[PDB]
Paper text:
To investigate the structural effect the nucleotide state of F-actin has on myosin-V, we have also determined the structure of the rigor complex starting from young ADP-Pi-bound F-actin, rather than from aged ADP-bound F-actin. To reveal the structural mechanism by which myosin-V senses the nucleotide state of F-actin, we have solved the structure of myosin-V in the rigor state in complex with young JASP-stabilized F-actin (F-actin-JASP) to 3.2 Å (referred to as young actomyosin-V). The atomic model of myosin in this structure superimposes perfectly with the one bound to aged F-actin-PHD, indicating that the nucleotide state of F-actin has no structural effect on myosin-V in the rigor state. Surprisingly, and despite having ADP-Pi bound to its active site, F-actin adopts the closed D-loop state, which is characteristic for aged ADP-bound F-actin. However, a control structure of F-actin-JASP alone (3.1 Å) confirms that actin was successfully stabilized in the desired young state, having a characteristic open D-loop conformation and ADP-Pi bound to its active site. Thus, we conclude that binding of myosin-V to young F-actin-JASP induces structural changes that ultimately result in the closed D-loop conformation, thereby abolishing the effect of JASP. Interestingly, our data show that the open D-loop state would not clash with bound myosin. The closed conformation may therefore be selected for its superior shape complementarity to myosin, which possibly establishes a strong binding interface between the D-loop and HLH motif and by doing so contributes to the high-binding affinity of the rigor state. Conversely, it has a remarkable effect on the structure of young F-actin-JASP, specifically selecting the closed D-loop state and thereby overriding the ‘rejuvenating effect’ of JASP.
By using the actin cytoskeleton as tracks, myosin also powers cellular cargo transport processes and can serve as a molecular anchor and force sensor. The myosin motor domain consists of four subdomains: the actin-binding upper and lower 50 kDa (U50 and L50) domains, which are separated by the central actin-binding cleft, the N-terminal domain, and the converter domain, containing the long α-helical extension known as the lever arm. The active site of myosin is located at the interface of the U50 domain and the N-terminal domain and is allosterically coupled to both the actin-binding interface and the lever arm. This coupling ultimately enables the amplification of small rearrangements at the active site to large, force-producing conformational changes of the lever arm.
Residue numbers in the entry:
A (entry chain A): 5 to 33, 36 to 54, 57 to 186, 190 to 595, 629 to 792
B (entry chain C): 5 to 375
C (entry chain B): 4 to 79, 86 to 97, 100 to 150
Amino acid sequence: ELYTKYARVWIPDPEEVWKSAELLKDYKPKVLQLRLEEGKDLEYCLDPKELPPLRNPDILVGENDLTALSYLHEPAVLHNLKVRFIDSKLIYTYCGIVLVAINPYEQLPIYGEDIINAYSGQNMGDMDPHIFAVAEEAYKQMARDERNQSIIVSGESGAGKTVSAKYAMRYFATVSGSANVEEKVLASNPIMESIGNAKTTRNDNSSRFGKYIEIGFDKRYRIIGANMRTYLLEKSRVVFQAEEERNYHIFYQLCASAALPEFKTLRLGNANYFHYTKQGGSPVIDGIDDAKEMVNTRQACTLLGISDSYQMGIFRILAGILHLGNVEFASRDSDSCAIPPKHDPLTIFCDLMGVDYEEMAHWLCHRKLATATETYIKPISKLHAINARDALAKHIYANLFNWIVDHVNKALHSTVKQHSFIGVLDIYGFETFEINSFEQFCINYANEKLQQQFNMHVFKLEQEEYMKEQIPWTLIDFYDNQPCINLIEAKMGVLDLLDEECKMPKGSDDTWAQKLYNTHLNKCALFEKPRLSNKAFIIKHFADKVEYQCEGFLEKNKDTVYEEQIKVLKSSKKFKLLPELFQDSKEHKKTVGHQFRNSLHLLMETLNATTPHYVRCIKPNDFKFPFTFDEKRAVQQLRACGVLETIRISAAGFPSRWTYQEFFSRYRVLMKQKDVLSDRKQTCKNVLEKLILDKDKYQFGKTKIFFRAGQVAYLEKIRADKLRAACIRIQKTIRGWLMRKKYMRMRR
Amino acid sequence: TTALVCDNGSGLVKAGFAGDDAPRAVFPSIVGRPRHQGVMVGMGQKDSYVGDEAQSKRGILTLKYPIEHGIITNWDDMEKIWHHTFYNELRVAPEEHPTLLTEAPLNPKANREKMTQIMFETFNVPAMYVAIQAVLSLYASGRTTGIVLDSGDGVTHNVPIYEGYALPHAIMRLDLAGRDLTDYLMKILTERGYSFVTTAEREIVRDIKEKLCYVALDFENEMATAASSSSLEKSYELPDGQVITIGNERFRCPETLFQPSFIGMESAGIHETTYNSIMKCDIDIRKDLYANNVMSGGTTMYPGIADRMQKEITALAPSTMKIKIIAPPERKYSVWIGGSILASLSTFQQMWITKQEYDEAGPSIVHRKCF
Amino acid sequence: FNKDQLEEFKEAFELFDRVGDGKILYSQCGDVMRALGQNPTNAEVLKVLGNPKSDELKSRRVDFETFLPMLQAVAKYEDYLEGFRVFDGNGKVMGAELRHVLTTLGEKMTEEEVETVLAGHEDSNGCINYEAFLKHILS
Ligand SMILES: C/C1=C\[C@H](C)C[C@H](C)OC(=O)C[C@H](c2ccc(O)cc2)NC(=O)[C@@H](Cc2c(Br)[nH]c3ccccc23)N(C)C(=O)[C@H](C)NC(=O)[C@@H](C)C1
Ligand SMILES: Nc1ncnc2c1ncn2[C@@H]1O[C@H](COP(=O)(O)OP(=O)(O)O)[C@@H](O)[C@H]1O
Ligand SMILES: [Mg+2]
């Protein structure tokens, strides 16, 4: 077998996720005699059955493409990235069609202008990987064919998705021949950060939405302009946070400026005074001045041509949402409530918005039914009043966000008709915490859909390459996460039962969980129950299993916005913006899970129109050190980006391809002169058919040999054996001949 | 596809799409035929009228009600009323949409058999179900425990429910009604000299009963009050513009619900059948039934019926045990609202009767699946 | 080995005796075997020596009589040609590649040994006729 003395293996180690070892005696069927670098010697158990991951030869290590490696497993990937990053400082790397970008915190020269002119024209493999190589592969495919192109970027927001997008746009501008997309797009970033980013337990300044920039090209492929869209915004954060989280930065940037005179009308308090900001208990981010960020947000708005009249509108509405949060109900009787007399938060909310106090106080505590002929004003429980108030806050914020994006687009658009576009998606990756909740559940469902699109695109490209090389395409094996997506989204899926439990009377998180267990517990292999609890469930995702706690779900999922409360706000006359938000039914009834599932189907329609290109970003250390690579953090990030699962899917197929001359050169050391022949293709067919016994392992394409995983490492080892033995024989002959001459000299 | 939700009764038909907040089509459920020789030529004489048309024309017509006491008692007129409901008044073809149908409990089985047979054969509805009115009132009022009292035109029935289980032995049914209150109102109104004989006059009496009756909080005290004083006495305008004045009688009319002995039945009133239904339930649940009494259907709309019920049950029930009456203002429609909620649920989509199951089993399937 | 062979070998052995006690070191056993016409690998030499430890390999001394069975045991071209054709197919070998493999793979030799055997054998391109070099080192 492949395990021999003088072979190298990876052993699992808790301090650094894998450690290298050498095998001291050849294996024969329950212990291995293992050398190390950490001391010479160690004794290592085999386990009931297992062999360690076997280590690739050092010709393949440090290749520009992880799927050049003959063994594909977590140790090889982690090592190969570490040696490229630490030794050569090559941050970019490839895996299949994906570009992995490892973020140095240090700045680099490599983005500099000349290289733009160097990459342009070059086919994707002909140059070492760099973000420009993907930017060209899009620009070239757009010019070559009708289709728009998309670039898709994933990872924890620290990982540097924005820097990758920024450089992609510089590539487009500089090759295309430009005006003022780049300066404007980078000018928008502080606004979209302030209103769309959030602070999460694992990460400060997380971005809770997917943001899409459509760069527009003329029929001459000159950059016209750009268009922005936003998807998947999580509304629930506005009303509710877990411990040690904040809702969107803008509320804290607004409260931090409460002293300033233009804000004084808002009567803003200390950031933990209000009900929406205080719940996380975490007002100050370490190492940020919020008041300074407010000034940067305003100046970015001014630079995008939102006049100061509207900026004071925006902050007026946000202070409105904060004051609305403090409104507090007393129950009269178990199915009725009212607001107490002259309640100070409601009075300030009515002053800030203009709506007359009696009408808000009336509508917050009642709802209106109407048949066409008759109308009933009906009281509602204190709980329903709270759910309606929070639904009104979420509805205001979601429309304010959509409005600010419509104005940014008004600055970014330009009049010339867009001939085709290239669209660069910054999204979040797969996400798991000690505690997982409706937010994580929606993020993971979005990532399952994106991962499905990626798997189908890779499978299409590989089918086309197999048909190109005259191989049977029926060999290639397709791996389909549709069974999980059907678990989450199909009828009597998790989301559909959550929506049912919202409306069913006396609904609760316990009765929801019980409906899950009845519906799925042993019917679907992907759904599992944690043994020691009844308030949680486990979904086997693409990447990993994830426990989700039930305790949040129904409280967060509910929206219903009572139509009269909007009609009251819409009637207000004091200022332009508040009527302007709500301008254009069934949608008011929809739950947050259903609005999310619709937004994700729009995103998938937008991407399906387009040919993708992928970037992954990984954050190499937890503490922003300039080049330290922490193999624990990088392993976690590589799992969360699905790179390891991509490599698993690839390793099943034929990952490794050789051109007949390049093969023939390397293995001419093995080949015998009788086998050498006037047709190298036939020569290699003969030699290979002898060297590796089972023809199932390899295929002959028209111009390329394909090999299953490991076979190239096997050939490299037999090559090293033959060359070693030949070297030993010549060395012993030369050593003998010289010492024998010294013997003859003593004889003479 | 949104299921239809249709709620038949004596009196109004209520229909609309599932997931709507309130019913889209509401109209009194009448089939009318002309009873005079048509003299004019080119009049456009029409074989029969349905719903609002029969109300407008009514002076020319005999009005018949095809449902008495929750039983469909001539199937041709009922099939006309469904035809009018789907085609004229909702304007949606039934071959597209599941349908949900509503019935009073403890009805004859043939009423469910025929109602399903007509839905599958004559409208080709792809799937149908039949719910109990009282169960649906609990979905509408937002509960899984309570004793529902639901009284419309036709049937009055109590159904106790406890955490989502019915208690079939405790179901009670009574035939006091908006309708028998109307016939009593005519028979007492005669005592002041006003005689409403024909069916189109009965519709006037029904409108007097809606506008002017109210349930006396204490009966003999208001009888003495009306004897002593005009102050209780109030007046109304018939369609031709004559005025009529009605006195103590206007509270006397809705009281027969509390004392059926007035119309001539012996079975006790809705308070005592509510109490007797609770008493037939086992002793551990009873606190929660007293905590929730849910009223439903139009005959519980009278001003003061909620307070008269709370007082009169409290007098019957043990003194410590808190009695509460839950009378939501919408309660005339709550059987439809409950049907809307139920038809919208995802779990229910399993539970429709489907056309294949009907073709396999024949129309008896309804008894097995529905209740 | 016969008496004549034993006499020639003993004389040679005594020429390699650098201490005068009529003995060699274990570490010299391989040297004597190669000086006597054997071409053992380092592994074979250590094996016939009994895989001695460093201390006795460097300081324990053995006379001819104990050495002899080991010499016997060790004692008991086309592969050489193909082995050289490994490093070629015009019958030449780069001097750099042969130097690298002889100094970095197998039982590594010193650069000076390789220079000594290679002196005068490379042409202006730095190419070695390996059939001639092989005959030379086998002579
Ligand atoms: C002579 C008798 C019965 C009948 C005349 C005998 C005939 C033979 O029975 C039928 O089959 C006819 C019919 C009927 C109608 C439709 C149908 O698909 C099947 C049967 N059912 C009726 O007329 C019911 C309707 C009804 C009232 Br209100 N509440 C009820 C509560 C529950 C159930 C049903 C009802 N009805 C008025 C009676 O029973 C009356 C009160 N019964 C009597 O006075 C006694 C002395 C027996
Ligand atoms: N405000 C009201 N007060 C008293 N009775 C009413 C009122 N509105 C309707 N009704 C009566 O209630 C009956 C209709 O009840 P309803 O439950 O709506 O019928 P259905 O049984 O078809 O649902 C009719 O007798 C009608 O006259
Ligand atoms: Mg009814």
